[PDB]
Write a protein that binds this ligand. Structure first.
Ligand SMILES: *O[C@H]1O[C@H](CO)[C@@H](O)[C@H](OC(=O)C[C@H](O)CCCCCCCCCCC)[C@H]1NC(=O)C[C@H](O)CCCCCCCCCCC
Ligand SMILES: C[C@H](Oc1ccc2ncc(/C=C/C(=O)O)c(C3CC3)c2c1)c1c(Cl)cccc1C1CC1
Ligand SMILES: C[C@H](Oc1ccc2ncc(/C=C/C(=O)O)c(C3CC3)c2c1)c1c(Cl)cccc1C1CC1
Lengths: 565, 576
């Protein structure tokens, strides 16, 4: 029921190209016939060819075989080009549909699943569905035409032998069933090696090389034993299946011996009746496995309809702000991550007056990073109110709201393009290269850019292979600087502070934070002390706050928190 | 070039394979007998047509069905055997390669690991070593099985109708050249799509991973329009991929179809058809047809074999990489712990600013020293150097009056205990984590007291199975404040003479830190200590405090003396 209902959810995507499937379909039909017409000629070559008629061996055969193969070769080229064309069109339509849909999903959708899983949905599953269905379509028709093309030729040239094979087919069918039914370690290998490379530091001291080598020996030998097992199982099945089929066909030949049968048979008749019986062994093998591949094709497809049926983040705000030099205010905000029942943030009131930088410090796991995630509306809240310019964040459209925020973090993912186009990301045409180039030196990122071979027009290549942890940060700063966003969110938990030129990064932040609202998950001592207000978060609550005469002494946790970092 | 680069690389791998040569020898004999079953069955067509239909019922009846059944049994056995033998030889060689790679990576420099992602090494050794066997195995099976059958078929063609065979042979070279040219023209474009698919991968991965900056910076169109382009080129290249073989396959068998028709156009002419009979033509032509698949498989062996050696080389380069330099030749059992830096300067690999310069400091046995200074300096670097993770550039680091590099890394590193919050917790029992590599040397009562003296038993006694609970699974079960106490339990048990204590990454925000402070006190009563200090407790009791900035020791003294002095140290006291 499901297996076929999914395909019918999929057919609409295919229907614009059905024009390619039928043309392929006929190309398949004529291919089976051409292969059937050559087993046909096998009788005139033997009987007529050696019934004292060199007429047939010179005329009939050498030129009809070349004729049939041209037809055979063109039908193959055509069906191949149609299926491939249709198969290409649907995978593209689907990859594109999932790319757009997944991109519009909320961050809750990305938390559950791996990024590679969602990427597998686009790269492989989308291709496996058309692969499994195309082959399904080919086998149903191509070998469905051959099987009837061959069965006719069988009975016509000798009804006696054919009906002896058919009566045996039920028993053979049941026999191939019982044997085809008799048709973790890899995870341990990857783990045993990964946690070795993880603890290489701890393996050198304590001298664990020995216990690690023999831990691996076990794990590597166990997967080798599982590896041989699967092939061994697979190996034996077909030899038996061939044996079974050979028995029945042998019995059919012991039948041709009887004088009533042999008299009807010539040298050619039997040669084609057994050549066509043998030609039936591949179509039968294909036609029995075809619904198993259609299943796996549609199971991968309902996976993607599960994704496509998922709902994109809700953007019902109908309010637009050109630019907001203004404060962000939390009004008794309480938040709980979906799937968790203990609020990450309890009753919280926080004010970030315009132009001022509020550095919030907190324990590594606390909901300090949850605060900067709520302002950008990665998640909607359960109770309370967050006001930007005295109006709820949910009042605004999400595009306008996020135009006011700029994110800066080491882990800011850098996309595959020029340095310059990363800095002017999604606004390349807006900013002149002079505007770009200035933002680069104002971020102290130029010190390493000119070292690059083409400098600013050098392209970050192969998924970001060239840049270092510290380098990305100064490009993230240049991106926010150039865009000049009213609200600055600065992630310093992921910063990787120990760098070759940290003083360069620090002054950049100095320039960026200035005359600009800034909300920083701070780990650095310098960005902390030269910040307008400090805010401590303990679990879901704010324990104590303080300015500059309060920075001298805090009532709550600051003394122990500062002492640790 | 590549037939040489592959063949010299193969002669590198044969040492790994030769211990299983017996498996190869057997597999091949079966493959031989496998190809003869197919050759001997096509011969059965001649007596069937000539005698069985030359008015004799014995041939078709009694034995003809028996023999074919027998031949199939032989085919099935030769099949299964060769398959099992190859799958056995491969499994071994694969496993062996892994143990060689694994063993070699464990002994690599620390620079090799901080620089390379852990994954890329892990993926290659599991994937490549399997490809080296798959490609090599398939190559062997072809040269033997199909190389045997072409012989078997060539002979049978010459016995039955010595004449027809030669016409095929004289046609062979031009048919061969005809086929090779057609083949080289079209089908060699797998990489063209690999590039295009890579761009589908990159764009999709960039969008999915960097999903949060796309939303903030509003690059949905720039990402969409980019995936619209690349996905189409991927689509197009997929078709150019099939069109390669959709065009090349029908052309090639047409070329071979001509050559056979000309052999069949001679079958009509009188000189040779007279001697021959209807039963010999069937076995001669079917043999020529049976020759087509073997000839296809063989001429594609180099492509298969060279590919396998192209992945075996990537495993050989990693093996050729230089391992940790280790020429000490000196072994020390329970060093005293008299560590002294003399004129040490050092720059991390690839950087151009030394992490340390003209460092001179002395750490006498049984006494602690605290290294405090601006975060991001080389105090961490100092700790790294005593374990030989990195060799200094200039100067010398002495352990009991001898340069560390004089010592065996094994002996040198058994002297050093490391305590920090970022210790690795191997997924295994708590007891076996406390006695990591010495489960055989330390009794249970020995392990029990080490955890007790580390003040860790409160959170161990709360475990599911207590001390035999399995911590690990990459460490979820243990908090940071609890990692230290396990790290401390390791050091108490082994009782190493030189302690490296890192509170930098440690968390003083722990419900039980007075218990962590008591464990630390008991730990360092005995031995030399080198603290990257960040706690009031340790700098309070430390024997010497050295202030480090920019890889230079600018002030050395006791906590009180430096406060009487009240210079740079007092500034830090005011700052923290
Ligand atoms: O698709 C190819 O690979 C698969 C994987 O094994 C093969 O099964 C497949 O072969 C079959 O599909 C062939 C089919 O089972 C039998 C029908 C084709 C014709 C068989 C011979 C007829 C005798 C004609 C006498 C006049 C593979 N495709 C090849 O095997 C295709 C096959 O070789 C067709 C090309 C044959 C060339 C014809 C030359 C005739 C010369 C006559 C002189 C006596
Ligand atoms: C007597 C025999 O009747 C079956 C019936 C069902 C089968 N269903 C599947 C398979 C193969 C399965 C596989 O390869 O997994 C076979 C054998 C022909 C291979 C089957 C043979 C047979 C042979 Cl022998 C050769 C040609 C035709 C038939 C029957 C008339 C259909
Ligand atoms: C006359 C003709 O001589 C070649 C020579 C080299 C070949 N080398 C490769 C291939 C196939 C390549 C592929 O499929 O990519 C073929 C065709 C017979 C298949 C080749 C045919 C021929 C045919 Cl016709 C049939 C059987 C034997 C031969 C040769 C005389 C031994």
């Amino acid at each position: 029921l499901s297996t076929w209902q999914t395909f019918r959810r999929l057919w609409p995507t295919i229907a614009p190209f059905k024009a390619g499937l039928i043309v392929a379909g006929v190309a398949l039909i004529l291919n089976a016939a051409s292969d059937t017409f050559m087993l046909s000629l096998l009788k005139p070559l033997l009987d007529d060819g050696f019934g004292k008629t060199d007429r047939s061996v010179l005329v009939w055969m050498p030129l009809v075989v070349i004729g049939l193969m041209i037809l055979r070769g063109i039908t193959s080229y055509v069906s191949s080009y149609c299926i491939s064309w249709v198969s290409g069109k649907v995978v593209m339509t689907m990859r594109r549909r999932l790319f757009g849909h997944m991109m519009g999903m909320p961050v809750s959708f990305f938390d559950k699943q791996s990024t590679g899983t969602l990427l597998s949905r686009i790269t492989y599953d989308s291709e496996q569905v058309a692969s499994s269905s195309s082959g399904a379509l080919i086998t149903v028709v191509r070998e469905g035409a051959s099987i009837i093309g061959l069965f006719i030729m069988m009975f016509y040239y000798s009804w006696q032998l054919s009906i002896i094979l058919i009566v045996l087919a039920p028993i053979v069918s049941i026999a191939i069933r019982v044997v085809s039914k008799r048709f973790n370690t890899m995870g341990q290998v990857t783990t045993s090696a990964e946690q070795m490379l993880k603890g290489h530091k701890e393996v050198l001291i304590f001298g664990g090389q020995e216990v690690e080598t023999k831990r691996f020996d076990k794990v590597s030998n166990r997967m080798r034993l599982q590896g041989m097992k699967m092939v061994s199982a697979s190996s034996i099945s077909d030899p038996i299946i061939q044996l079974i089929a050979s028995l029945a066909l042998a019995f059919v030949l012991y039948a041709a011996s009887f004088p009533s049968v042999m008299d009807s048979l010539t040298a050619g008749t039997i040669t084609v009746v057994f050549s066509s019986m043998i030609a039936l062994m591949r179509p039968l093998k294909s036609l029995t496995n075809v619904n198993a591949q259609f299943q796996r094709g549609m199971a991968a497809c309902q996976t993607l309809f599960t994704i496509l049926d998922s709902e994109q983040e809700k953007d019902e705000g109908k309010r637009v702000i050109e630019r907001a030099t203004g404060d962000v205010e939390f009004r008794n905000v309480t938040f709980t991550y979906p799937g968790r029942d203990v609020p990450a943030l309890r009753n919280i009131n926080l004010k970030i007056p315009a132009g001022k930088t509020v550095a919030l410090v907190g324990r590594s796991g606390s909901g300090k990073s949850t605060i900067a995630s709520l302002i950008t509306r990665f998640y909607d809240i359960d109770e309370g109110e967050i006001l930007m310019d005295g109006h709820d964040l949910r009042e605004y459209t999400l595009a306008s709201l996020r135009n006011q925020v700029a994110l800066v973090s080491q882990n800011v993912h850098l996309f595959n393009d020029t340095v310059a186009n990363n800095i002017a990301y999604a606004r390349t045409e807006q900013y002149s290269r002079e505007q770009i180039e200035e933002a680069a030196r104002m971020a102290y990122a130029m010190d390493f850019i000119n070292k690059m071979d083409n400098g600013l027009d050098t392209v970050i290549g192969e998924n970001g292979v060239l840049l270092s942890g510290g380098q990305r940060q100064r490009i993230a700063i240049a991106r926010a600087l150039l865009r000049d966003s009213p609200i600055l969110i600065l992630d310093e938990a992921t910063s990787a502070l120990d760098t070759e030129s940290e003083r360069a990064i620090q002054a950049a932040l100095d320039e960026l934070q200035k005359n600009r609202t800034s909300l920083v998950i701070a780990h650095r001592l310098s960005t902390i002390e030269k910040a307008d207000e400090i805010v401590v978060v303990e679990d879901g609550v704010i324990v104590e706050r303080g300015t500059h005469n309060d920075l001298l002494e805090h009532r709550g946790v600051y003394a122990q928190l500062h002492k640790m970092q």
